Scaffold this active site. Structure first.
Site, PDB file in Angstrom:
ATOM      1  N   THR A  90       0.824  -1.200   0.000  1.00  0.00           N
ATOM      2  CA  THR A  90       0.000   0.000   0.000  1.00  0.00           C
ATOM      3  C   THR A  90       0.864   1.259   0.000  1.00  0.00           C
ATOM      4  O   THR A  90       2.017   1.251   0.441  1.00  0.00           O
ATOM      5  CB  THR A  90      -0.934   0.003   1.211  1.00  0.00           C
ATOM      6  N   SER A  91       0.295   2.348  -0.518  1.00  0.00           N
ATOM      7  CA  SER A  91       0.984   3.633  -0.513  1.00  0.00           C
ATOM      8  C   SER A  91       1.144   4.151   0.909  1.00  0.00           C
ATOM      9  O   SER A  91       0.237   4.033   1.737  1.00  0.00           O
ATOM     10  CB  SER A  91       0.224   4.649  -1.359  1.00  0.00           C
ATOM     11  N   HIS A  93       8.555   0.607   3.122  1.00  0.00           N
ATOM     12  CA  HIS A  93       8.168  -0.696   3.626  1.00  0.00           C
ATOM     13  C   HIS A  93       9.426  -1.520   3.863  1.00  0.00           C
ATOM     14  O   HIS A  93      10.499  -1.233   3.321  1.00  0.00           O
ATOM     15  CB  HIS A  93       7.232  -1.405   2.636  1.00  0.00           C
ATOM     16  N   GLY A  94       9.297  -2.543   4.694  1.00  0.00           N
ATOM     17  CA  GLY A  94      10.455  -3.367   4.954  1.00  0.00           C
ATOM     18  C   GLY A  94      10.070  -4.675   5.595  1.00  0.00           C
ATOM     19  O   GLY A  94       8.903  -4.924   5.910  1.00  0.00           O
ATOM     20  N   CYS A 126       9.106  -1.467   8.480  1.00  0.00           N
ATOM     21  CA  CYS A 126       8.783  -2.628   9.286  1.00  0.00           C
ATOM     22  C   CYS A 126       9.968  -3.577   9.316  1.00  0.00           C
ATOM     23  O   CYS A 126      10.849  -3.545   8.448  1.00  0.00           O
ATOM     24  CB  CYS A 126       7.542  -3.331   8.734  1.00  0.00           C
TER      25      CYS A 126
END
EC number: 3.4.22.56
Lengths: 92, 5, 141, 92, 140, 5
Positions: free
Chosen positions: E28-29, E87-88, E129
């Site tokens: 997601t954005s 993100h991660g 994350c």
């Protein structure tokens, strides 16, 4: 109201992720040697993270491996302070 | 200064 | 409030797990010099007013049982908790004399919701152990 | 005289290993919000490790998730300071 | 003892701000990250860092940017700051089109591969994350 | 206080 259940942990690792940690057969491990010296010299004066930063420096600058096996010879070590602490830690 | 852990 | 309250009646426990000798079926070498470490640590934390308990040559089962038991003590009058682990290891893993144990399984006993008498109090883990097999070749200054 | 090649790194992670890191759609991430505030307030006063410790406290104590999805509701976060620094760091 | 921080320049602050991800990733954005990037730009400007904001970079772009930044002459600079907003997963940061190992990024600045930063603080600030666990907290 | 990274 609440705090995270992982809060207020500190993990003082002897070496960086992925790496060997080094030990002297006679004097003990480089990290524990250095940690005891720094605690003895500074626990009445410095905050714990700052003591551990001096341990990092002592391990990084004063120790180098000596080995008859060229693969393990002349190696270095840096410890790894992992802090989930939320306050400063003074031992006095 | 010689063995590893 | 910016500093941990350290004027509880007791500084706390300092558990030192010193594994020198491993079952030969593990393939792991004796950890020469670790007795010097364990004694250095005992005197250091004694001078910081910790109640030091040295445990030697524990299997993975005895490490988990000891940590469970310590975590179930009443730490209400203790300012902090210190655990020192001296052993072989790999990333995320400390070795008992007979095999590996995840560091996460040790430290989870002291989570804020599982050790209520240490909630809000500093929990220090000092881990002398390998975290892999990479070697730092260093760089001249 | 050498130093480790992994020395003098600091990793300021927004959250503990294995965990989600939370973000507010309008104010930004809990961690970056808290980090910018604490730098603004204390970069002229405190060593960097102590600033990040304030960030840990701010994130841990002042934020809690709100979600219509009970799985994600009322959750907490602690950041993770990973220091291979050998010296203290002051921005002033 | 403390780092020498009075070189002519404080150093670079590289902010990589990934908001929009390729649909092939299913991520997601990251609404709100622009506020983060702007908050960080002003903060590090006040600490006298040369800020370079970069937006929506693929994994190949991050590696190439990090490689190029590490090949600069940092001899006049006190330090180096890199901020990753994305993100991660554990050990991993996401480009817009896929994951990059964090170790790959930081290895460019390693003491023997970036000599003009040897002995100088290299700070990586990672908002991402590291897994899917949730901290349910404990009352006090 | 509502999405994750």
């Amino acid at each position: 109201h609440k705090i995270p259940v992982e809060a207020d942990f500190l993990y003082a690792y002897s070496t960086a992720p992925g790496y060997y940690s080094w030990r002297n057969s006679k004097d003990g491990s480089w990290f524990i040697q250095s940690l005891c010296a720094m605690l003895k010299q500074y626990a009445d004066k410095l905050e714990f993270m700052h003591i551990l930063t001096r341990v990092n420096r002592k391990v990084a600058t004063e120790f180098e491996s000596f080995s008859f096996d060229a693969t393990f010879h002349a190696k270095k070590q840096i410890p790894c302070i992992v802090s989930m602490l939320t306050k400063e830690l003074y031992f006095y | 200064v010689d063995p590893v852990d | 409030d910016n500093s941990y309250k350290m004027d509880y009646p007791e500084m706390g426990l300092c558990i030192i797990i010193n594994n020198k000798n491993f079952h030969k079926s593990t393939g792991m070498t004796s950890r020469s010099g670790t007795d010097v470490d364990a004694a250095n640590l005992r005197e250091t934390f004694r001078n910081l007013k910790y109640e030091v308990r040295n445990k030697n040559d524990l299997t993975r089962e005895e490490i988990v049982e000891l940590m469970r038991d310590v975590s179930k003590e009443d730490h209400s009058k203790r300012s902090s908790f210190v655990c020192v682990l001296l052993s072989h290891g790999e990333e995320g893993i400390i070795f008992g004399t007979n095999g590996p144990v995840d560091l996460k399984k040790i430290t989870n006993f002291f989570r804020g919701d599982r050790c209520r008498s240490l909630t809000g109090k500093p929990k220090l883990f000092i881990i002398q152990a390998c975290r892999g097999t990479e070697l730092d070749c260093g760089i001249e200054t």
